[PDB]
Design a protein around this ligand. Structure first.
Ligand SMILES: CC(C)CN(C[C@@H](O)[C@H](Cc1ccccc1)NC(=O)O[C@H]1CO[C@H]2OCC[C@H]21)S(=O)(=O)c1ccc2c(c1)OCO2
Lengths: 99, 99
């Protein structure tokens, strides 16, 4: 779709077979999801945002459906204030900004 | 224009008589600009993201040009690691996310 921005661009995602709400976030390089049980191997990583750095579990090559569109890529799982879909997966679903 | 997400969606902005580069950020409710000496009154605010909260100064009715498009609204100034154009101004320039 075409999504205007008067409200937060929230969508439903499916990750690990579970439905979740997430924010489409063009200011995020990476996708960061709240703590959850997730099938796949992971490696310890750090990621930094506006307020500093947090520890995350990095899961590569994870199947994730975003508003009905398929992506397979890296998901960082950790104590984020919000589930955010970043450019690593927005590019997979063909998203662009337009004005 | 159409702004790709293969790279960070950076555009040139003009604020306080200065040109800066800033992210077009659908994940940001508010606009956050790196520390600069804007004139006039302001109100203290705290905003939160990955890593926690930062202290910012809230300035209202600030004139800001975004990739050639005029906007006017609230801008938060403080020790952000990125200049962030949030939805309060993205809506004013007619930006959408499309996929
Ligand atoms: C986390 C989301 C819900 C909010 N953030 C906007 C993001 O787009 C942010 C914007 C951002 C960009 C760069 C540096 C810091 C923040 N990106 C970010 O944290 O991305 C992280 C994941 O991928 C990595 O790439 C960039 C940092 C990492 S934010 O910067 O914390 C923020 C912006 C304006 C706000 C706000 C919070 O509260 C109210 O108004």
């Amino acid at each position: 779709p075409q999504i205007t921005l008067w409200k937060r661009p929230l969508v439903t995602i499916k990750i690990g077979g579970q439905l979740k709400e997430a924010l489409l976030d063009t200011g995020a390089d990476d996708t960061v999801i709240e703590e959850m049980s997730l099938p796949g191997r992971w490696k310890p990583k750090m990621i930094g945002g506006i307020g500093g750095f947090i520890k995350v579990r990095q899961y590569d090559q994870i199947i994730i459906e975003i508003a009905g569109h398929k992506a397979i890529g890296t998901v960082l799982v950790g104590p984020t204030p919000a589930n955010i879909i970043g450019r690593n997966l927005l590019t997979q679903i063909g998203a662009t900004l337009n004005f």
